[PDB]
Amino acid sequence: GPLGSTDCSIVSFFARLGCSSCLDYFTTQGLTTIYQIEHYSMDDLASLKIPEQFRHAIWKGILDHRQLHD
Treating both helix axes as pointing N-terminal to C-terminal, what angle do 10-17 and 21-29 enclose, rounded to 10 degrees? Predict the structure, then answer.
């Protein structure tokens, strides 16, 4: 049986936030990870063909999470 965790990627993070199509794109590209977005600043995301309309939101959500928690 699992032990709390089972799969840890941006998929679960998008599910909570309400992000739908953006999660699809991420899992389809095969580059969805939590610890990576925590190091991949706004520039890498822009170079990943991610538009500002969503890019700054993804980054803001995770940076806000790690900022509000420990």
Answer: 170
Count other C-beta atoms under 10 Å from residue 65's C-beta: 14
Candidates 37, 15, 35; CA nearest to 45 is: 37
In angstroms, the CA 10 to CA 23 distance is: 7
44's tokens: 């890498």
Closest CA to 54 of 8, 14, 7, 9: 14
Determine phi and psi for 29, rounding to 5 degrees: -65, -30
Q: At residue 1, what is the residue type? A: G
- For domain 1-70, the question of CATH label 1.10.150.50 is answered with yes
Tell me the three state secondary structure of residue 7: coil
Structure-determination technique: NMR
